[PDB]
């Protein structure tokens, strides 16, 4: 609830954007918050399939009724609780805080960095990150320049 | 004692080559039946007994977890993430 609060409302972009590491987002972020409601539709495609079967049996309506509610019971028992969804979102919520931040913060400074920006897209040509060329560059000094 | 005389007399002389032919369909019946009742009735005992304790204590299930920080890249509009793996702890008694 805590971070909930401090992210306000997530937006599926994110969710998208946090697949990468999880692909199981949307499903996990779907049985920690009340989103949306939850169909057991497996559960009761099983039922169906069950159902089929004892009408190609001739079975009686009331075992078919309970072999199509097991299943559904089977999949609401198995989809609900899950308290590990839990701290799977409570991990994007705290990623999504920090990407959020972030972006405030390129927003905040972008006019700032506009003519340094102009100027860099045209002297390098990649796109990687300053950080890491810098890191990248720290270790080549280390490694070839001469000490002296 | 009990006059056991008869049962003792069966269980010393029974025949060793009489068998009876079983109805596969009604055993698979009786044998469906029992199935039933264990996964569809003792099943809800025996997830609840399972689950339960998986839903009042959850973190003892999942060991570790992963924190993050972020900082901006504003030359290239990106965001760069530095994880970080933790022991998942209580916070906030
Ligand atoms: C990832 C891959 C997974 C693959 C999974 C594969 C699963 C395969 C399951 C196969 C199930 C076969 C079931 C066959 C039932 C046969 C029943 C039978 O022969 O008896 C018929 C009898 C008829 O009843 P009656 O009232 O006498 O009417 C007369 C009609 N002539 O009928 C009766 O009297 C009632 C019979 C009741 C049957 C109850 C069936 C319960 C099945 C529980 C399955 C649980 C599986 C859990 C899996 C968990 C996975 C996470």
Redesign the interface.
Known sequence: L?RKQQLGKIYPEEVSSYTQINPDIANDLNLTFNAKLLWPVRGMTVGAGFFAFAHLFNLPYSFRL?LFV?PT?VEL?FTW?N??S??KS??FM??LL??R???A??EK??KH?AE??AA??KEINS??????LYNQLITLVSEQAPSE | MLDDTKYIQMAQKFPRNVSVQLNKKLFVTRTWFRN?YF??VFGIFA?FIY?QP??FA?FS??PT?????????????????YSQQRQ?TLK?F
């Open positions: 805590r309970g097991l019971a028992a609780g308290k590990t839990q701290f409570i991990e705290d990623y920090q990407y931040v972030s972006k913060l390129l400074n972008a960095f340094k920006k860099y897209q796109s990687q990150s300053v950080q890491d | 039933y996964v569809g997830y689950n998986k839903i959850p299930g999942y977890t992963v924190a993050y920080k972020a900082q901006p890249d504003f030359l290239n509009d990106q965001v760069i993430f998942n906030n």
